[PDB]
Amino acid sequence: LQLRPYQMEVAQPALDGKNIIICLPTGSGKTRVAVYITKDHLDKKKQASESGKVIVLVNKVMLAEQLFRKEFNPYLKKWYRIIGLSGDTQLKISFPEVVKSYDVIISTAQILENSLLNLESGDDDGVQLSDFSLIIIDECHHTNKEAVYNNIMRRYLKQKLRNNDLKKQNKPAIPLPQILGLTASPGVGAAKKQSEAEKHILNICANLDAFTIKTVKENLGQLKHQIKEPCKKFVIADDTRENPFKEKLLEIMASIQTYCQKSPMSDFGTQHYEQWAIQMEKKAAKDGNRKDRVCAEHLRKYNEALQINDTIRMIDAYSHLETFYTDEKEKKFAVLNDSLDETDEFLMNLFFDNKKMLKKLAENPKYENEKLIKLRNTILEQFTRSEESSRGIIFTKTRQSTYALSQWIMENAKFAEVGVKAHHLIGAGHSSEVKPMTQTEQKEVISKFRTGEINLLIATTVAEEGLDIKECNIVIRYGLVTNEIAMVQARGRARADESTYVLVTSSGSGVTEREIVNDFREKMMYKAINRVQNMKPEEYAHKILELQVQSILEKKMKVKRSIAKQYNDNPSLITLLCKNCSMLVCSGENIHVIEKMHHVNMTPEFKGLYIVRENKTTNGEIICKCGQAWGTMMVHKGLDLPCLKIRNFVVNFKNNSPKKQYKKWVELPIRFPDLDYSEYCL
Amino acid sequence: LQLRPYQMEVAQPALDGKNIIICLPTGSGKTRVAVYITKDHLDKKKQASESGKVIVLVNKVMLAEQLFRKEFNPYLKKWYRIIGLSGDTQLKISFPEVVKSYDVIISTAQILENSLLNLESGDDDGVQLSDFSLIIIDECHHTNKEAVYNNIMRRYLKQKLRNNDLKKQNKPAIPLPQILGLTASPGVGAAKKQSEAEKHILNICANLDAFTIKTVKENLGQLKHQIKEPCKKFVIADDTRENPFKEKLLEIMASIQTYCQKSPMSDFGTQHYEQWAIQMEKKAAKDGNRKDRVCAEHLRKYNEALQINDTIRMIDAYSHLETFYTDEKEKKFAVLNDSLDETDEFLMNLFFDNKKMLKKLAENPKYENEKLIKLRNTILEQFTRSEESSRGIIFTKTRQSTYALSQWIMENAKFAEVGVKAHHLIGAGHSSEVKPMTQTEQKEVISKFRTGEINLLIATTVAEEGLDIKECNIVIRYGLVTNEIAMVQARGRARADESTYVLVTSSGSGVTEREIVNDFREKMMYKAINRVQNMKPEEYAHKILELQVQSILEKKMKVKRSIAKQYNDNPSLITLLCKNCSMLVCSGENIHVIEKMHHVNMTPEFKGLYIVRENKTTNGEIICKCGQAWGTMMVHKGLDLPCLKIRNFVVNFKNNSPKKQYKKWVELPIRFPDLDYSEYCL
RNA sequence: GUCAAGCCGAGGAGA
RNA sequence: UCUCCUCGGCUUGAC
RNA sequence: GUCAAGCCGAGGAGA
RNA sequence: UCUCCUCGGCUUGAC
Ligand SMILES: [Zn+2]
Ligand SMILES: [Zn+2]
C-alpha cells in the first residue's frame, strides 16, 4: 500500500472516528485514500474483535464496476471478501446475505434504499444501518434536498436523534457507523452571497453528519505542484444568415396563426412560444373543441423546426419537418384505407406546395451557417498542429445536434484528408424519439476512442461526468453551459499537458459570465471551506444539528402531505374519451391492470373501434380514427393486449365531468382493477 | 408390506383421491410409499369392480430398470401384472396393448407422449389419459415450462378445463385419473425473493394439479433422527503460475490479430472472446470474404487452448493444439495429393516453429500447476486416513478434464503406492469429439466401483444424479457448481457416516456464495412449503387454476406462432455453396432426401468436385478442395451416398441472395425432394 | 447380448 | 445469441 | 453475453 | 408549470 503526506493529513482524523467529508481535485487518488481507510478500519476491528462492515455507495453502475475492477479489489482482495453490486449485475445471491457474507460491499445507493424500504414494510427482512460499521459515499455533492444519499443519511440522522433522546433518558442506544464522504467540488446550490454559500456547505455537512470538510492546507503546495492546469480559449460568433428560409417559415407561421386568428405575443423561435402552444393545446383538448388542438400541435412542430434551424442548418429542420409530416401522411393513408378535416386538409394543401418550395430552396449552401464554418476552421487548425495526436471531444446539447454534426463532419472531405475520425455519443435513457445508445455501445465507443480508433468524439453531458480518458487535449463546447461543478469536472477531464478548453459560442449566450462566476464560486467555496474549518466547534455542532432538524422535519411533513393526498374508491365511475377527437373510448369497468403496471382493455367493442398501425421498421402501434396515437400492442400473458398511454386520452367524471388532463397513470386518484383473466378463456 | 408412521402421515390423503405431491429426503423409501399407494388403489378398484390402470413415469431408463427390478416388481409381482418399458427395451408387443394388458406400467414419459401424438394425428390408435386411472411421476421438479411431464400434465389440464366447462353445462364428463408426484427438493426456478419462490412452488403444484405438497411435520423429528448429515470441507487456491507458456501463447494471439488487424476488446481466454470469434467467422462466411473466416477459426482454437491451459497443464493444451493442427496438415497433404493460401501458409510457417518451441518448453514441470498439487495432497491424506476404505468420487466439468486427470493420476506413483485405483466416467450423448461412454460401459464402471475394483471414480454431472452407491465418503468437486437441487442430491449421495464433501476451487469462483444461497433456498423452500400448506384452500385452488390457465394459453399461442412459422414451396430455387471457399457446390434440383432424415446428392458433377478422406482409424469423411469438411459417407439403400451437414455450407437464393447460415437442416423454410431412386439403376 | 452412425426434442450451468 | 454439461425418443446399419 | 418494450423515482440546465 | 439533458431502480419479453 502507498500513501502520500497530504493524503495522511486529510485522512488522519477519519482513522479514529470523525465521520467527515473529503474534497480533492480530480486525479488525486481519492479511491486510494478510501481503500487505505477501509483497510485501517478493518484491521482495528479485527484487533478489537468486533464485526467490521463497510459499504461503498456510488450513483453510477459504471463507477461501481470501475472501482471494483481497477483500484478497490486488487489492493484488499487477499485480506477480506470483496464484491460489487448493481442493477445490471444479477443479484442472485441476495442483498442481505452479501451484507452478512463479504464484510465489504460496493453498490449503488438505491439498492440499499430498496432493502431498507422492504425491511420497514415487512415484505422482506432487508437490513438496517445498525448492521453496518462504516459507510463511504462518492460524489457527495449529489447529497442534496431529497436524493438517494440524502434519504439514507436522513434515516441515519433520525437514528442519531433517537440516540440523542435516549442518552439523557436511557443509557442503552443503537450504535451508529462511521461516515466518510468523498468529492472534488462540494458545489454551491445556486447560493450567490458568500453567506449563502456557507449555509449551503453547512447543509451539505449536516446531511452527512460531517464533523468537518478537512481539506489539505499545509501540504497543499506540493499537491498544487503535482497537478497541472490546462489552457483556455474563447471564440464567439454572431448570427446574420438564415434570412430566406427563416422568413419563408415565419410566413408559414403567420398564415397558420391567421387561420387560427391567434397572437403569439412573443418572438418566434423561443421556448416561451412552445409553452404557450402547449397551454393552448391543453385548453383546446379540455374544452373539447377542435380546429385549434391539432393546429396548436402543428404550431409546436413548426416552432421546433425554427429552433433547430436557428441551431442547425436548414436541411436538418427540413428533414425533421418532412419526417413528421410523412408520418402524418402515412397515418392519413391508413385511415383512408380502413374506411377529410378542414384544418388537416388546409394545412396539408398549404404544406405540399411549401414543402416542394422549401426542397427547391434547401439546395442553397451559400448561406448555410458561419458557426459551423468557424468550427471547421478551429478543428482543422488544432488537428493539423496536433499531427495525429488530437483526442478531440465535442460537447453539444441534444441528440439531433450530435447526430447531424457527426454526419456532416464525416461528409466533409477536409477532415478526411486530415485523417479525422468522428463518432457520436449519447446517453441511455430513451427519450426524444432518438435511438438511445446502449451501455455496451457506450463502452465500445469509449474503448475505440481511447485506443485511437476514433479521433473525434461528439458527446453530451454524459461525457462531462465519468468517462475516464487518459488523453484529452482539444475539448470544445458548442454553445452550452451547465454549472460550476460540471464545468470544473469537464475542464479537469482535459488530462494532458497542452489541452485547449475551447468555447465556441454565439454572441447571445453569456457563457463567459458563467465561467467567470464559476471561478469566483470556486474561490468563494475555498474561502467558505476555510471558514467552516475555522468556525467554533460548538457553533459548528449547533448549526449542523439545526440543519439536520430542518431536513428531518421537512421529510416528516412531506410524508404527512403525501400520506395519500388523493383518496377515492370508485372502480368504474368515469369515461375515457379520445383527445384529438371527442368520442367515448372506454369506461372504468371494461379496463384492467396488469402487474400493477400496464393498463389495457380487451372488450370486443374496444376491438372494433380503434385502428392498428403496421409496426414501424410485434409491439405495433394502435391509433384512433382521427390519427391520434393511443398506445402500443403488448405481449404479456401471451395475449396481444393493446396497452394505452393516458397522456393521449381525456377523462370525464360521471358526477360533474370537469374535463382535465392527467399525463400519467399514477397521478390520478382513482384505481383500476387488476386483470382477472378468468374471462377471455376459449 | 412394511410402512412407517411418517410415510402414512404423508401418504394418507392420497389413499382417498387427493392428487398431490410428495417431497422426502433421499433414502426415505419414496418408492415404497408409491408401491403401497398403488396396491391400495388396486385393492379399492377390485373391491369397487372398476378398471384399475396405473402408470409410472421416469425421465431415465436406468431408473425404470432399477424400479422394475429392485423395489416395484417384487412386492406386487404376485397380485397383478408388472412390466417396465423404455426405448432400449424392445417394445415388440405394443404400447397400447401393454396398457390394456398389465394394468400396471413403468416407462419413460416420452413413450406415452409419442402414443398420444400418434392418437391425435390418427396414424396409430395410441391411448388417451381417460384410459388410465392413476399416474405416478418421479422427480417432479423436472416438470417445468415445457418438459415432457409438463406436456402430459398440460394435456390433463386441458381435459380438466373441458370437464369444468361441461359440469355447469352438461352433466356427463370425462373422468380424470388420480395424480401422484414424487421428489425430494421441488426446487426454485431461479426465484430469489421468497414471494417468487412461493410463486414457483405454486406453479409446480398447478402443473401437476396438486392439491398440496403434504410434507411431513408431526413425525418429522423421528425422520430427522433416522437420517444423518455428512461433513463439509472448503479449499481455495490462487493462480500465479503459467507465465512463460501463457505469455508465449498470448504473443501468438497478438501476432495473429495483427495479421488480421483486429481488436478483441476483451481479456484473452474468456468465453466472450470465443463468442466474438464465432460472430466474426459467421460474418466472414456470410460476406464471402476469406483471410478472416479461417483466421477466426484458428483464433477460436487458440482461445480454447488457452482456456484448457488455464484449467489444465500445458501438456494437455499442447496435445489439443497439435492434434488439431496435425489433422489440418493431413487434410493439406491429401489436398496436395489429389492435385497454397497466404493465410494458411503464413499461419503454418508461424506454427511449425512455435510448435517446436512449445514442445521444447513443455518439458518444464517446475511450474505445472498448484491446484493439482493441492488435490494430490488432499487425495493422499484422506485415502491414507481411510486405510483402503475410501470410495473417492471426483466431479469435474468436461470430458477432457476427466480423461486427463484420470491419466495423470494413474501416472503418479504416490497414489500407486497408496493403492489408489482411478477410472473416468462420462455421459452417453455424443459431442465434443470425445468418445462417449456406452450405458453398458457406464454400468460396468459403476459395478466395478461398487465392489471396490475401482477406488477413485472421476465423473461429471451424471454422477450428481442417479448412481445409487452404498458408500461414498470423499466426494470432491474440482471447480464446478450447478444448482441447489443437484447440490443437495450430490451431498446426499455421500451416503456414509464420515463423508467429506470437499470443494477444491479457485479463488475466482464464488461457489461458497452459491452453497450458502443453496442452504438459504432450502430453508426458504421449507418455509414456502409450510406457507402453501397453510394457505387458504379456496385461494390455493384459485391460484392453481390461474397458473393452469397460464400454461394452457402459453402452449396454445406457442402452437399458434409455430403452426408453420416458415412456409415456402420452392423445390429447386437456391444454390448451395461451400463455406470456407465460395464455389457453387449444388442446387435445389440435384439434391434428394432419404427417410425424411438424411440429405444427399448423387450427380456425377458432385462426384467429380469433392474429395474423400481416408476414414479415421465405411463411414469415411468427405471434404472440399479448401480442406472444409462437407459430411460423411453413408450406406443406406446400399449406395455409398455422401451425406452432408448444412452447418458447413452456405445458401444463396436465386431471387435476391441474402447470404445467411442455417446450422440445421430443419430450421430452413424450404423442402427438399425425397430420393426417388428409380434413376441410378444400371 | 454388443457396437457404430445419423436425426429430433428437452433440461441444467455459465457467459 | 454462444459455449459446456446432461437426459430421453426415433431411424438405419453392423457384429 | 446481447437486444427490445414498459413503468417508477431522482438530479442538472434553461425558460 | 413547460422544454432539453443526465442518472439510477423495478418488471416483462426476446435473441
Ligand atoms: Zn380520436
Ligand atoms: Zn471449399
Author numbering:
A (entry chain A), B (entry chain A): 307 to 645, 669 to 946, 956 to 1020
Article passage:
Cooperative filament formation and ATP-dependent proofreading confer MDA5 with the necessary sensitivity and specificity for dsRNA. Filament formation induces the tandem N-terminal caspase recruitment domains (CARDs) of MDA5 to oligomerize. MDA5 CARD oligomers recruit MAVS (mitochondrial antiviral signaling protein) via CARD-CARD interactions, nucleating the assembly of MAVS CARD microfibrils, which function as supramolecular organizing centers for downstream effectors of the interferon-β (IFN-β) and nuclear factor κB (NF-κB) inflammatory responses.
Four cryo-EM datasets were collected: I923V MDA5 filaments with ATP, transition-state analog ADP-AlF4, or no nucleotide bound and A946T filaments without nucleotide. In the absence of nucleotide, the I923V and A946T variants both had similar twist distributions to WT MDA5, with intermediate to high twists (81°–96°). Closer examination of the structures of the I923V and A946T variants did not reveal any noteworthy changes in the fold of the CTD, where both substitutions are located. In contrast to residue 923, residue 946 is located within a partly disordered solvent-exposed loop that does not contribute to the core fold of the CTD. This is consistent with the absence of any significant effects of the A946T substitution on the overall structure, filament assembly, and ATPase activity of MDA5. The A946T substitution had no apparent effect on ATPase activity, structure, or filament formation on dsRNA in our assays, leaving the molecular basis of T1D-protective effects of this mutant unclear.
